[PDB]
Amino acid sequence: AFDTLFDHAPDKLNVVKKTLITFVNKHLNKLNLEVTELETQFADGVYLVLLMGLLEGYFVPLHSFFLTPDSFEQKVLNVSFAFELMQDGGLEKPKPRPEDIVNCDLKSTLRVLYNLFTKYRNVE
């Protein structure tokens, strides 16, 4: 379903990528953070954690994740934790492994972001 939007409408895939960049910036800009590149800027898990707190209205204590991850393992832990926050918020367990996000799997990244977008479009 998402993979048709990914593969066999490459100009729609670019529309999805443009819509997702608009959405994540509406929230992350409040922290003076800007996203220009979906293929790498969510791979270390930090922006996903910050985005979930912006979308669901909480702060994430800095001892709960790695704000500046120093290893592949810490990025995996960040993404895993962000996945837990998503499930805390009502989303079903995300499809990709946390390693898939850290490895900049473009498809795994937009699927996670688009499910965030589907749920939180109207959050101000």
């Binding site: 707190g53 909480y58 702060f59 994430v60 204590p61 001892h63 709960s64 994740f65 926050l85 805390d88």
Partner: protein
């Protein structure tokens, strides 16, 4: 046999639902001739371990020995209850937050505000004598209740349990900067509570919600990493300004203990 079976869920008369959110549901009800509030906890991946932990953690909350502490009356163990559930007495005026920020009938005067401050400081001083401290107890204006005679009481039902996500803070404006960043075991928890009291003093002085224009994630990030602080209000008495500044000391070790600010607040009373 278990030492406590807890409160029988079947004996609860649920009357009217008050709220529902991330953590569960709040109901007004009745139990054994008491007007009560029932908190039904929503917990993902409930387990026997978490149930055992809930049942070990609840008895500590049944504190009947101090006028400025509101006890948990008891808890429903799950199983056999459908959900882990806490019961407390219904407090007619609601939370301090409600009385200060959502009071449509009257505005509490500053004599009453000083009494609220003294009440909270006395309850916190008592709680800080407990060994060990009640864990995961955050002080803010939503976790203080106002009883029928306008007595402020620290609510023991508003603790977070071990199985509740430590990674989601919903009232960061009252949390000490060090507690936004470090694990509780790496902080002096009593000193962190005094910061929260300083923010309560600010709230009582301004009658504003701290950082109301910012989201929770904005608040925590800016207080922790950018030095965002409440602005000391203009044109207040030097004595109040001095008290607020010492309770909000950047150095946790320099903040006073609650038992040292109790006599200070006593002298600011009308009586």
């Amino acid at each position: 046999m278990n030492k406590h079976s807890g409160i029988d869920f079947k004996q609860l008369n649920f009357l009217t639902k008050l709220n529902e959110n991330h953590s569960g549901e709040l109901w007004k009800g009745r139990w054994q001739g008491n007007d009560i509030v029932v908190k039904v906890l929503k917990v993902r991946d409930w387990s026997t371990r978490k149930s055992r932990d809930f049942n070990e953690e609840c008895p500590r909350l049944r504190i009947f020995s101090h006028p400025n502490v509101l006890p948990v009356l008891g808890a429903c163990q799950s199983p056999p209850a459908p959900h882990p559930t806490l019961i407390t007495h219904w407090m007619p005026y609601g939370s301090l937050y409600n009385v200060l920020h959502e009071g449509t009938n009257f505005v509490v005067d500053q004599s009453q505000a000083v009494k609220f401050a003294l009440d909270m400081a006395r309850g916190m001083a008592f709680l800080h004598t407990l060994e060990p401290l009640i864990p995961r107890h955050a002080l803010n204006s939503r976790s203080v209740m106002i009883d029928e005679d306008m007595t402020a009481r620290i609510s023991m039902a508003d603790v977070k349990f071990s199985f509740q996500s430590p990674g989601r803070m919903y009232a960061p404006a009252w949390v000490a900067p060090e507690a936004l960043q470090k694990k509780p075991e790496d902080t002096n928890r009593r000193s962190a509570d005094m910061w929260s009291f300083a923010v309560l003093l600010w709230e009582l002085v301004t009658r504003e919600v701290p950082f109301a224009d910012l989201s929770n994630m904005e608040i925590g990030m800016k207080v922790a990493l950018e030095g965002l602080r409440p602005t000391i209000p203009p044109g207040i008495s030097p004595h109040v300004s001095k008290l607020m500044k010492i309770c909000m000391n950047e150095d946790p070790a320099k903040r006073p203990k609650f038992d040292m600010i109790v006599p200070i607040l006593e002298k600011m009373q009308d009586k």
